[PDB]
């Protein structure tokens, strides 16, 4: 009982023809493609009620659709613009089973009009203020991830190689490093707070983990910098005394 | 023919206060309604489904919703909001009792939950960059939820919005914002300026 989309993010160029896949292991007859945009909820592009079948949803314009096999539903953007910049979401269901919709996990698509603009983040960690340690007997580390485009990052924290949820806050949206340029690079901060006892034990390891998503193996690149592929940039600090 | 509307794209309430998320529908046929939740980093998950079984429908995570045919409505409530309730919520309608056939979704409501900060001591702290190099961030932290944090005025100085972190080791929440630059005149005793409480510790 799962639905999996081929990609989790992609970057693509204005005008390019685009292909997302969606597969399900439940033998479901019904498959649906939506997009989700802020303020507009989920809107149905195309659905399919059997193998070889399709039907237009509410916003079919610009999109195409293929149900070749029962288990799979391809969505094709004819010519990429930044009106198709969005989050895409596949779902399936059965006709007789009473269970409703199972959703995939989505694929984020961003369409840019030039591919030499995509950068990974670099990631610095800033150790607490002693002033804070003194006043509060708590300690806050800050992680910056900077110089990334497009806005595709997943920031995590690890304490002694074990992901931590408690004591974390990451900005829900990023600020623009150059907020005039149409497609400026982005920056995003995050905070990890622990007790000063914890910060002040030299055995403890703290790692800011950042996974970024840019270019696949396939994409052409003959620029001077490292091909800005999907990757994990981390940063590191130890306990102090 | 079916449609759905969610009046209110953004709702902010206090921790422990009443949560109410609206949904209204039109349907030429018998309708079936659903609520979905989308937590910051996860996918869409079912909260509750109205099936013709009964009028008040209970769901997951403390939520409930009454189906009012006379009104045109299926509003989502929870009496006491919890921080963990922050997310986007989506209402949807179908012609199938099970939601097996095509769902029509609304425009969503993002729910933001405001922390009750019990014992505030707002301050501004300077943190050093790592590997013994000196670039500078400022952390404005521990402030009351009344305090908002305006954008910069200087372009090449960066200020994030406030953010809430929840230490459950110690049953302790705290708000913070970050300001940084590389400019020579940047210092943490003047990076924030904007409805910022007079009793801040600055060292």
Residue numbers in the entry:
A (entry chain B): 2 to 242
B (entry chain A): 0 to 202
Sentences from the paper on this structure:
The key molecular interface that enables T-cells to sense these threats is mediated by the clonally expressed T cell receptor (TCR) that classically distinguishes between self and foreign peptides. The TCR governs T-cell specificity by discriminating between self and foreign peptides presented by MHC molecules. One key feature that is likely to facilitate this level of cross-reactivity is flexibility within the TCR complementarity-determining region loops (CDR loops) that form the antigen contact zone. The finger-like CDR loops of the TCR are thought to meld around specific pMHCs, sampling the peptide cargo, and enabling T-cell triggering by ligands with sufficient affinity/dwell-time.
We generated 12 structures of the F11 TCR, that recognizes a peptide from the influenza hemagglutinin protein (PKYVKQNTLKLAT) presented by HLA-DR*0101 (DR1-PKY), between 1.58 and 1.89 Å resolutions; 5 structures of the DR1-PKY specific HA1.7 TCR, between 2.31 and 2.98 Å resolution; and five structures of the 003 TCR, that recognizes an HIV-GAG-derived peptide (SLYNTVATL) presented by HLA-A*0201 (A2-SLY), between 1.26 and 1.37 Å resolution. For the HA1.7 TCR, we observed a larger shift in potential positions for the Cα backbone of the CDR3α loop, differing by up to 5 Å. In contrast, the HA1.7 TCR structures, in which a large loop movement was observed, were solved at 2.5 Å average resolution. However, there was clear density supporting both conformations in the HA1.7 TCR structures. Similarly, the HA1.7 TCR CDR3α loop was free from crystal lattice contacts and shifted between structures. However, several other loops in both the F11 and HA1.7 TCR structures were also free from crystal lattice contacts and did not shift between structures. However, we observed several CDR loop re-organizations between structures for the HA1.7 and F11 TCRs, while all structures of the 003 TCR were identical at the level of the Cα backbone. Thus, we conclude that these loop movements represent real differences in the conformation of the CDR loops of the HA1.7 and F11 TCRs due to the intrinsic flexibility of these regions. Although this analysis is an approximation and should be treated as such, the average maximal loop motion was slightly less (6.4 Å) for the 003 TCR compared to F11 (8.7 Å) and HA1.7 (9.0 Å), consistent with the structural data demonstrating greater rigidity in the 003 TCR.
